[PDB]
Amino acid sequence: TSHCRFYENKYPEIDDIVMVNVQQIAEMGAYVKLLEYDNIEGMILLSELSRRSIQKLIRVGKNDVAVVLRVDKEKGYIDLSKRRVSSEDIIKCEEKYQKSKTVHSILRYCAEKFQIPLEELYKTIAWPLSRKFGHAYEAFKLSIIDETVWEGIEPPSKDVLDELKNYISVKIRADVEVSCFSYEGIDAIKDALKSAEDVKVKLVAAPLYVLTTQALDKQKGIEQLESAIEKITEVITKYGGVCNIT
Amino acid sequence: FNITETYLRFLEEDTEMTMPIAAIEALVTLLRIKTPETAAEMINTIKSSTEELIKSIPNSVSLRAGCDIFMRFVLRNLHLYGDWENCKQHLIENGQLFVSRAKKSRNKIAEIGVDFIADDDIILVHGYSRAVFSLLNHAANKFIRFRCVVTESRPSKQGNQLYTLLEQKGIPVTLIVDSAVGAVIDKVDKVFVGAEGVAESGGIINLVGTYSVGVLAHNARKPFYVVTESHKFVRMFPLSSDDLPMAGPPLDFTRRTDDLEDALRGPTIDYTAQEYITALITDLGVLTPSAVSEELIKMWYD
Amino acid sequence: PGISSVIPTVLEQSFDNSSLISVKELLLNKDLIHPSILLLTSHLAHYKIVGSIPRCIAMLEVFQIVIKDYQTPKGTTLSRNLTSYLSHQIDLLKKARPLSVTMGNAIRWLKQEISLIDPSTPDKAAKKDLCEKIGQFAKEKIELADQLIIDNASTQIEESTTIVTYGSSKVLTELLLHNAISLKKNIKVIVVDSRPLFEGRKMAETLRNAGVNVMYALITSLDTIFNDVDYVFLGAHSILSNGFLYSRAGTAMLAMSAKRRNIPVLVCCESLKFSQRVQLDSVTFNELADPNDLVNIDYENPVERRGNKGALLNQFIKERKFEKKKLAMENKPKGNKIGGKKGSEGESKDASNEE
């Protein structure tokens, strides 16, 4: 289920910047939904959303840039403004929206795996990460280099935490064509296996060896595969045979 | 606080407070109580009250049109991104100023639209609008010679009502039935009409026999007139000759009866096309054909 | 350069206002023209499906392909030989089939975009943003606008209604598909067709594929099908500054009958379809085609018979001429649906000044 606000409190304030995904058009303005501050409706009027004929502008398509004017903290009524946001601030509005969208993507694997509500998981994360650290994206960037933010609050789900770390972190296929014509070769292939595995190396046929090299940041698999080619060439030159690598 | 109840209070009043201008004044009073500072709290509740008003409507069109213009003016207020307070004060004040504009417009038209009635011309008048009768009265004030022919319109018996209001002025009259209205177009110089609404296309929204008048006049080549105050424009496009917003019957055929109770049912509001109107008169200058649409395009900005 | 002059059939005593010629089978041409243009010209020369709206969409997509294939020369800048190449395209298109109004507004938009972008920015960064803008332009002025016509028509049409149509207009096909499937009404749709091409047949076929109650008729059989009908939809091509409806073949005949038989005429249109050119009769500027399509006894399209007709050149005066794009009279249609919602035909140039 997709709910719960990005911030701590339900309703916005004055001067705070948001990003809206347009839902309707014409007459008043647009009763919609937000991608920066909750999924409830927050209305704007045609005047605000014009500045600068118009029908071609957005009309419930992608995303814009708006600033909250009037908030009702009783039942739920939000007013916005598109014009007011300055050109220098627009780039900052887009980056906060990108930060909010990454936080929402992070807090969705947790609800899928352990079959528990998303609002409870959003509440337990947004206390040391969102309130004390600054933002949840930079706290996640700190946790992947050296775990220091995650160690504060104790997690009831550790298997979800391992699944999320695996998602932040892919096998690249490699085939070796062994065609040895030497006196001793079995001990050589065993020596080449002990240097490359210690990722997953399997046997399919007598000449062909299938090995999948794991990559953390995708480009890491190339450097380790090239090291594996260098280690295979060093092994077979001494015994008296040839190993062809693709 | 109610808006339908405020409109219901106008029973013995009327005449000065025109039906839409009294509904617009009721819209401003409902706006000024619960703070017009918020645009989410107020506009949505104004929209709900107009929806409640449409649901309570039996056979009126102009109340929906008048709401639109109000809305438009409200939105246009703070189009200059002005102070959220002086713009508000100008919005609340433009309620009594809106009703005061109905008097100023009537002062304009009654001096413009007396020019159409020439020296000694017999007129066949149909329907009753406050603009058309004000032309008729202020031409008598101008001391001009004109004869009058009364059409027997059948809504709540309007012909008899029109005839009595002509008697109070001092202008010679006689009753003509809408069946025989074809037999009159030879001793009649000009045919006049007062509309309930004017279409986006350039046609007319009117009473229980007006299209029939328009066609007969087109046959006899005798001019056909529409005179109104400039607030009866809706974004409505009746595509066919018999299609209109209704709460009652769109032509019903009843079963065999002996006591005689179910009979009357016929189209009480009828449309006529753009071609049949020779001339149209409002306070917004002297204009007829494509003019109405240009007004609506200017307002709606779409 | 191309093939010019030498035309089939007689020059004709009556109706000689437009060109009657052209290249169908490819013989002697320049070896620089992009093949997607060559495909479209061979398509439009013997096309059965297209009618105004889709022609421009295809013309836009072909242009998008050209820009994607365009790599700026090291010596000559972007605005050097592009506009000459585009002029070669239009001239080849003119030889194949006279352009629509919507095609002209597209070319005018593109030529405005060439002048807007100065040769100073990097070439790969230039074309990447250009095609994005064209895509957004095609979204707004066609697809999203079409959807706006759809919903405008939806409120206008009454529940359980009979509609007679004509042509093969993209907007109306989707209109009727929206009526049958998304709204679910009792819509009896009657389709009419002429002789040069079976536009209506194709529309009826597609409606049958949806599963609609369809009658299929002809111009000769009109005074029998009417005596039922409630609304008539016409496939627009161009509405002029006058308010006259310049559309396909059997259009005005229908429009006339409708006006006389009480029931109104409705026309769905685009904001790109309006022009500032003006005319008052069908003779003015006509889209003439070769009598070769009218030789065979029709039934389908290719039958190849040893019939009664055959000779046009050798026969002593036998002008078997037909027109394609005709004019409907002004007063007869009542509704127009566009980007600015609604407006009667007598208010034609409220879009051209609004731009």
UniProtKB/Swiss-Prot annotation, chain A:
One of its GO terms (biological process) is formation of translation preinitiation complex. Changing residue 59 to A: Alters the binding mode to the eIF2B complex. Changing residue 50 to A: Inhibits derepression of GCN4 expression in amino acid, purine, and glucose-starved cells. Transmembrane segments: none annotated. The keyword rRNA processing does not apply. Keywords: Cytoplasm, Initiation factor, Phosphoprotein, Protein biosynthesis, RNA-binding. InterPro entries: NA-bd_OB-fold, S1_domain, S1_IF2_alpha, TIF2_asu_C, TIF2_asu_middle_sf, TIF_2_asu. It is found in: Cytoplasm, Cytosol. Residues 15-83 form the S1 motif domain. One of its GO terms (molecular function) is translation initiation factor activity. The modification Phosphoserine is found at residue 50. SUPFAM superfamilies: eIF-2-alpha, C-terminal domain (SSF110993), eIF2alpha middle domain-like (SSF116742), Nucleic acid-binding proteins (SSF50249). GO terms for cellular component: cytoplasm; cytoplasmic stress granule; cytosol; eukaryotic 48S preinitiation complex; eukaryotic translation initiation factor 2 complex; multi-eIF complex; ribosome. Phosphorylated; phosphorylation on Ser-50 by the GCN2 protein kinase occurs in response to low amino acid, carbon, or purine availability. Phosphorylation inhibits the guanine nucleotide exchange factor activity of the eIF2B complex. Eukaryotic translation initiation factor 2 eIF2 is a heterotrimeric complex composed of an alpha, a beta and a gamma subunit. The factors eIF-1, eIF-2, eIF-3, TIF5/eIF-5 and methionyl-tRNAi form a multifactor complex (MFC) that may bind to the 40S ribosome. Interacts with CDC123; the interaction is direct. Interacts with GCD1. PANTHER family: EUKARYOTIC TRANSLATION INITIATION FACTOR 2 SUBUNIT 1. Present with 17100 molecules/cell in log phase SD medium. Belongs to the eIF-2-alpha family. This is Eukaryotic translation initiation factor 2 subunit alpha. It comes from Saccharomyces cerevisiae (strain ATCC 204508 / S288c) (Baker's yeast). The gene is SUI2.
From Swiss-Prot, chain B:
Belongs to the eIF-2B alpha/beta/delta subunits family. One of its GO terms (molecular function) is translation initiation factor activity. It holds the Pfam family IF-2B. Disruption phenotype: Inhibits GCN4 derepression in glucose, amino acid, or purine-starved cells. It comes from the Eukaryota. Present with 8970 molecules/cell in log phase SD medium. InterPro entries: eIF2B_alpha/beta/delta, elF-2B_alpha_N, IF-2B-related, IF_2B-like_C, NagB/RpiA_transferase-like. The modification Phosphothreonine is found at residue 288. It comes from Saccharomyces cerevisiae (strain ATCC 204508 / S288c) (Baker's yeast). This is Translation initiation factor eIF2B subunit alpha. Acts as a component of the translation initiation factor 2B (eIF2B) complex, which catalyzes the exchange of GDP for GTP on the eukaryotic initiation factor 2 (eIF2) complex gamma subunit. Its guanine nucleotide exchange factor activity is repressed when bound to eIF2 complex phosphorylated on the alpha subunit, thereby limiting the amount of methionyl-initiator methionine tRNA available to the ribosome and consequently global translation is repressed. The keyword Transcription does not apply. SUPFAM superfamilies: NagB/RpiA/CoA transferase-like. The gene is GCN3. The lineage of its organism: Eukaryota, Fungi, Dikarya, Ascomycota, Saccharomycotina. GO terms for biological process: cytoplasmic translational initiation; positive regulation of cellular response to amino acid starvation; positive regulation of cellular response to heat; positive regulation of translational initiation; regulation of translational initiation; translational initiation.
UniProtKB/Swiss-Prot annotation, chain C:
The keyword Acetylation applies. One of its GO terms (cellular component) is cytosol. GO terms for molecular function: enzyme regulator activity; translation initiation factor activity. One of its GO terms (biological process) is regulation of translational initiation. It is found in: Cytoplasm, Cytosol. Its main location: cytoplasm. It comes from the Eukaryota. Residues 342-352 have a biased composition (Basic and acidic residues). Residues 328-355 are annotated as: Disordered. Keywords: Acetylation, Cytoplasm, Initiation factor, Phosphoprotein, Protein biosynthesis, Repressor, Translation regulation. Disulfide bonds: none annotated. Acts as a component of the translation initiation factor 2B (eIF2B) complex, which catalyzes the exchange of GDP for GTP on the eukaryotic initiation factor 2 (eIF2) complex gamma subunit. Its guanine nucleotide exchange factor activity is repressed when bound to eIF2 complex phosphorylated on the alpha subunit, thereby limiting the amount of methionyl-initiator methionine tRNA available to the ribosome and consequently global translation is repressed. Component of the translation initiation factor 2B (eIF2B) complex which is a heterodecamer of two sets of five different subunits: alpha, beta, gamma, delta and epsilon. Subunits alpha, beta and delta comprise a regulatory subcomplex and subunits epsilon and gamma comprise a catalytic subcomplex. Within the complex, the hexameric regulatory complex resides at the center, with the two heterodimeric catalytic subcomplexes bound on opposite sides. Present with 10300 molecules/cell in log phase SD medium. Belongs to the eIF-2B alpha/beta/delta subunits family. This is Translation initiation factor eIF2B subunit delta. It comes from Saccharomyces cerevisiae (strain ATCC 204508 / S288c).
